[PDB]
Amino acid sequence: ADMHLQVVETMVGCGTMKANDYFVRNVLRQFSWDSRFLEVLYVEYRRQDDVDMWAELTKRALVWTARYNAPASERLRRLIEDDYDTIRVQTRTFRELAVFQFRDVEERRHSRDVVNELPNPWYDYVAHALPFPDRDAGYPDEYGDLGQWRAPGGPGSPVRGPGYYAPPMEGEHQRGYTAEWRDLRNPMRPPEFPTPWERKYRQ
Amino acid sequence: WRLQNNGRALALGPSVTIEDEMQSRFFSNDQFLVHSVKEVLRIVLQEHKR
Amino acid sequence: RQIRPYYNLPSKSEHGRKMTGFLTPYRHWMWKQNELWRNVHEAQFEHLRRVYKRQWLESFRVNADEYIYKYNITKAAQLAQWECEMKEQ
Amino acid sequence: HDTDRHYWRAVTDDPRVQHLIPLRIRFKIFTWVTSGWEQRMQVVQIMAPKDSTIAQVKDLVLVENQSPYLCVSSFHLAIDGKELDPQKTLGEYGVTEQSQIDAIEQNDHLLHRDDERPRDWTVDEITAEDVKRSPYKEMEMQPLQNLAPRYEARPKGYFGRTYYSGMKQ
Amino acid sequence: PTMVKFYHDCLVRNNRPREASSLMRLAAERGVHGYEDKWEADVYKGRPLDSSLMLRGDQRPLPENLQALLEEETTRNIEAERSVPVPFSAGLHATEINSVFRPRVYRQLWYKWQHIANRYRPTAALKRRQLAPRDSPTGIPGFYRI
Amino acid sequence: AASSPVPHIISSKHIDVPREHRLRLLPGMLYLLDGDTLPEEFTINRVLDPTALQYYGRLSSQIVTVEAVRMLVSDDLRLLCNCITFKGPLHLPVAPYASLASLRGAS
Amino acid sequence: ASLRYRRPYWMMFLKGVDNWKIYTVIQQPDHQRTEMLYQAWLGGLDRPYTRPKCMANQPLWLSKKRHMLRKERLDGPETPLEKYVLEWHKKFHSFQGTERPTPDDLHTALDLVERPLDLSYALQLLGQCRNLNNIRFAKETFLVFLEACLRVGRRDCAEYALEHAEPLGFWFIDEDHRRYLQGEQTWYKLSPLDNLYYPVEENAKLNEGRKP
Amino acid sequence: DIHRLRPTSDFKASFKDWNDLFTCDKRQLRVRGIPRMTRDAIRTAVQAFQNGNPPERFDTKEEWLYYKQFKTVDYSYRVIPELPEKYRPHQSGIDQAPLPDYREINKMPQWAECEERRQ
Amino acid sequence: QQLSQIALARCKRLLYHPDSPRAQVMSEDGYIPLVELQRHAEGTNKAALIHYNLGIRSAQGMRRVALGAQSSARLAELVSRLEEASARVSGNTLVNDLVHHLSHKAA
Amino acid sequence: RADPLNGGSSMTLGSKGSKLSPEPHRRRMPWTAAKEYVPGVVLNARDKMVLDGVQLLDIESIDRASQLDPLEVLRAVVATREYNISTGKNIFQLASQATYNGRGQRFYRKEWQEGTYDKYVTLSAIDFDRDGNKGTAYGYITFHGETTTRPVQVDFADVPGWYMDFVEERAVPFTGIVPPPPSIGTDVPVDPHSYRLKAYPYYDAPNPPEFVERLLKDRGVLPDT
Amino acid sequence: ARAVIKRRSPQLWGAPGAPIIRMRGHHVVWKFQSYDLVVEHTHKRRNSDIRLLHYLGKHCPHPQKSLWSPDTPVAQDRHLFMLTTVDIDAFKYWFGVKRCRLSMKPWALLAKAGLLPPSLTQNSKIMPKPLFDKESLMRYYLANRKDEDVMAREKYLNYENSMVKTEEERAAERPVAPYL
Amino acid sequence: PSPVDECLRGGSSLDKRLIQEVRERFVSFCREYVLMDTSGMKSTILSTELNAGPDYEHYDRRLRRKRHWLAIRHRFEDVRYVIWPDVVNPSLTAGEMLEALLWLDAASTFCVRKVHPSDLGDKSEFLPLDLQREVEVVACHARRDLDFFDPSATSLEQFTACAALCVNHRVPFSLFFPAQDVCGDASVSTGQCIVANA
Amino acid sequence: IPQEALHWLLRMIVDNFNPQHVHYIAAMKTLQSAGELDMARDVWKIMERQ
RNA sequence: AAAAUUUUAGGAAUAGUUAAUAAUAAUUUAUAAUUUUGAUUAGAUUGUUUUGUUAAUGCUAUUAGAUGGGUGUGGAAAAAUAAAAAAAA
């Protein structure tokens, strides 16, 4: 399709009034054409002797954009808008123009207002979109309690062993239960951080 | 009303021209030398445009 | 739900619904006036929807970077300590 | 979905690696100039394995002839006019990429074809339905729009007001 | 009444409206207790048992060379409709789907001369919490079991 | 065919494949010929149904006026040939190189 | 709402059946016996029969057979028009049929009138041919209809048809026919083969000389 | 008043005037002695009028009464028929299909006889 | 010629599209109960097919087909034998493919 | 889906419309696909006060004792014809009248021509059932000049409310084939004096003053009484 | 899709449907009733052990007197207080990336926090709804239309990206002389 | 016990109608074995059943098929000379004899093979039967009748099945065709007869 | 939006996954095709920091 | 999909059965499978660190649910009742 596009653009620039005929015969129904074709054909149309011929050609081009699934681009729409006085070819939707009206007036009013220019932490940003806290709130407590018999706790419980005494444990399990597991009721030190940042919080 | 393009056949004519060549890894040494000259010209072009 | 005004096409049927569901061309026109007033509300709603999408999607980038930095320090230190313990064993 | 690999292997092992040479095959084509029917030349890039036979090379050329005009009648491969034996290996003819080889199209018709072999057939027996481009031409690394990115809508252990422990596991 | 029920169901399963209707009329006339409102008209009055085609009286037989074609078509259509298998069955007629029968004794009952073929009573007759409090045996082992 | 030379669309009398390979190789095949002559060993059924002929209206008007449409059923009733006879010159401009310009019946 | 979930799926878009609830329970033994006895009551079968499980209305073959095995209300035609009416209902009312009548068939129906009862039959056929089968009458349709009316002697019928011709489908009523029925010109045609202004009582009135 | 269980039209005498109707809140509306549903209907209609929607809606009482004569368990807008115990003629005692009297029904009508006499 | 061509084409179909819908088989005069069910149904709308989720699945003697170890091994010899003894079995592109299919599936 | 009403906008669950997309929302409910429909309750229901005062006869009432006077049967015919035409005309009822069954002429429904909406079907084929009022019709849809390329079946061809304006030029014999009417701009050039386009994919009709007055009175902006 | 529908709680588009912010209550007399902003399915799940998708916060519908009056008294700090806890990060996650639905009561509650605009149903009884005219709207749009690049860049900043580096920051990040 | 058992009551077997009755009952018994629903059937050597049959509760899953096969073999020993009488008007048609032979052959092909220690019978009783003599009898009765193999579609299946029986049971396939086809020829194999008369 | 490619690359890290060279290549390719060259360099820096 | 945690004063046998299979829909092959480390059946019987009590890893208590023959429809049977979760203006 780009080859036909350059052909059409060359015709329009050269000023022959057959670019539209070539577009209809060669690239309209047989190709998946963007609206740059029409951005060129609109300049081609604008040179028509009859203002009504210009307008009708524009409207037919829009109907082509609808029938063949090629949306009208913003540049094409603005090109057609810039001639709204001579040809009254509407180019913006009855919803789009209403939202433009309301949003634009609101935005100019908001910018010209001074108080509402102040920052708002609730609407400005999100803080800590991560799944886990960025610091240790102390929890969990990996030790049971005196009234608790369910020592390992099972699926959802963080407790890993009974509160005070347990059966004999071996290797890493004994090491963890004796020393390394989180003991959250300790009154002298809180649970201990990894190696590089325990030293700098020792005191 | 219009002529569509089913998943089976490209039935509307391409919307962009493409080059009929292998990938850069399947070229010969001299073929990739031609490709190298082409690509340095392409970079000259993009820098001129920039 | 869909409003059935008293003055749309009535179905003169005694074996079903007594009012059809079509509408006078005036009801077609006024419905747009209500549709548009609703659309200006939808513009800001969707706008904020996408803006909040972006805000959450960006705050993740900042937080994950700091987490990645600290966690990589943690990982290097832990691996070194583990190697020392393995050497002793 | 039984693609026959059930683990992540980031390497490419030997069986999928093939030794191949980039041959060019010349074709006798006629172009219409103002006078009429000027003779011209058309080429097709083929990646034939080093050990392939000339019949296999011809059959491969049948497969990259996307052009509806080029490979339509039975043809034979030749070197500077001397026709090639279809059951002769490339090495026995000494043909290399710098070898001018022509395809003379005998004016028969109804060239018997068998698309039963997918254009992208490796030992791994993958069959991508779209055969619009050869594997040697496909980039194979591009954004896939026929899908939707899905976020995690199922909280694991933490659902609400206070993250005590997160009910991990 | 049990015999009448079983035989009527068998005749309906075997596509015998004549015998089923005659049995219903016979049971209604003899006054078997379950069947005294089941008397129904005889739609085969003045018809033979063994040697044709049934006509309403406002119908005439087609010319014989054509009646033969029609009966040939009708037997073929009837057998074609009969052949197709009905899904979510097991080749089981509706009269024998969900059709478990065990004797009278199987649900907490004993012999009686007049109950010749007595299907065990529905399990809904007795409730556990109606027979004994919670966490206590109801003294009816085997009940509630098919 | 009016604007490009397509290879095997204009041909001789008829593709003469063996009677045993006819139904294997022939179906899906298409070709144009000069003058109305029908293949061998076929039963001809000329479609007269307006509901079926309405579908060539854009072919009959904007491309070529269609004389006739016929369905040729093999004697074994296993293969079928839709054959359409057109009259007159093309309503489309035909290129000098287009394979259809090599047809006496057209142009 | 929709009955998609209140009745089996083979009854979707079903309307106008006896009581679509019957065929949800026909599977019971009692309702199956009722169905077979009902088929025997309807007649047309030599063996016990039940409607197919996934069908509510009678099967097409069975309905065609029972329509063929239906004795016509007449049971003895006295006149060729009675025989032709029996043939008309045989041909254009057979069962779920396709062939429409035609103006020439209507002409044959109208030209076999000998009794005013026959003309009543022919007018019923005309009504069916104008309303049920929206076929254009021919140009001479009104000619044959007027002749059928006069040969049996009912001028009021033809006058009423002229009064309501467009609704009757008489798109072409000849000027002479219209003029005769609306008063003057007591003749309505000139016999080409006989050279007489019909009706013959009117020809004997005006034209006293016969010519070939 | 559109609903059979919201008889707003029964309380025309419960308000003194237009402004009395439009100013009374839910509490005073209940105090005047109005059912819950009628109260809510009146309040919602008044508020819709305030927002600019006049009380212009189709009275559904006749539709719902037509649909109430069937056995829709959920009071939906289906139509569920009733299947009586006996639904066939032979079952209702009718021995066999009626036979028409062809001689009786094939007699020349009186208009036909009179006109045939006339000829 | 026709028989050999179709046999080789079937071999290629079963080799290059194993278990594919185009490589399925069915009992000859196979009983497709969906068609029979549709024929004997009160179909008011002839688009809502009854018993769809089962009828579309079920058909007599319907299977997915593919080459096993024994089939591939025997078909290799038979394909090579269909060729003349003078031909190079190395350059056949179907014996090689069958051998690689065996090796890949065994691995 | 292909055609969201307002993009992806789920503010109130009415923002999507009363139909989320034109395509059917299930592969097993093809009849739910979005299309233009007509009020069959009112259109198909003829007025029976015309058949009042005439004794119709069953088609099976072929017996002689139950047949009516010739004048009575003629009155029944007239009453039945007026009953059928009471609500409107079928495309088939118009085609039967037409010379070549209407082939070539353009049929339209009443609202296909009302403000901003311009559409009609150039007939291409009719197949009448035994009941000539029913059947199947085909044609080329023309929408604001743009026309289909092939004939498609006309929906609601049975429902009354169709119109036709005969012209001898368009009629085609059963020998010939209706030529598809040209697409304005594609097949034939555009000429403002011949066909001037009423609307186009970004045009919305101006607000009627009576409608704005009515809506303002409803809203309460204007002092009604 | 049930033969007999749940007559008292009908819904749209079946179960479990899209997620939705509802303002769930408690089976308690109003005198103690309080609500909780929760994210859940359209068809409330009372089968699984997981009733809801996320717990956004809690609302107390009973005003509480300002216990904080003496602390730096600001304008009208003695008016009664309506207490609410809200999870803004999770709300933004579910609102933006998950495109969940929002009920009107929660929408009105959140409009008080500066997180959303006033609801569609929070309509002032005084101003009537607007009346739109295509010609006037077109005249306004043409009179003050933005330009293509500024419009596109505002859209890009709002939706696609907000951390776009300056030339100075690119130069700062750019590596230096040794290049190792 | 089988209905063939109740037919073979030591009565005057030389009755045409009794012969068709016996033939149809034996054919039905063989079809019942061949199309038997073997879903839950299990034959695993179980030590507990050494000095007894399979448990009463496991009669259907373990004993039924084996008993059916033994019954078929034993009733065959009694009925074969009645249905396919040796070659010296005949009571049964060649087609009926062929159908009975084919169903018997199918049962023999799908005989029971696993011999449990509990069995008191002979091991040889768990092996396929040999039907060479019956095939030869059917061959005599088929050659004596013309147009046995007609162009009818089912006749293709009959030809295939007949060739199968002849190949399996070591009997020349030529016997199924008139002796004039074999006159002047020393020996024609089943394959040659197939490729000639197929 | 193109940022989502970088977000999904970072979620691999946060989930204690080791992204592979193919993941890095895909992220860089997609971001470059979208025109986010600074984000592509950010992906490279993430790789290096890993 | 898997791992893992049950009860009975008078303690024993269980089975539409285990694995293999070119077997969708098993005519096949095997020295198969469950159980004294307490099975099967029968009896009791939703589970249930939430209840209560105590110095107590003891004793004690409990209602989240689920549901192979009623339409084969539906994305999914959860479908004969619905303090209401607002259900396309």
XYZ file of C-alpha atoms in Angstrom, chain B residues 7-8 18 20-23 26-28 30, chain D residues 22 45-47 66 97-98 136-139:
22
model
C -6.640 -15.799 9.443
C -6.058 -18.289 6.622
C 9.132 -5.775 3.362
C 12.906 -10.684 1.169
C 16.092 -11.771 2.926
C 17.313 -14.211 5.554
C 18.255 -13.186 9.077
C 22.365 -16.887 8.169
C 24.393 -14.636 5.862
C 27.765 -15.541 4.425
C 30.736 -11.459 2.153
C 23.205 -20.120 1.177
C 17.661 -17.536 -1.635
C 17.738 -21.151 -0.442
C 19.435 -22.540 2.662
C 5.939 -17.690 -2.628
C 27.385 -20.172 -2.891
C 29.560 -18.590 -5.608
C 15.381 -18.433 8.168
C 13.394 -15.276 7.359
C 11.256 -14.977 10.494
C 12.803 -12.710 13.105
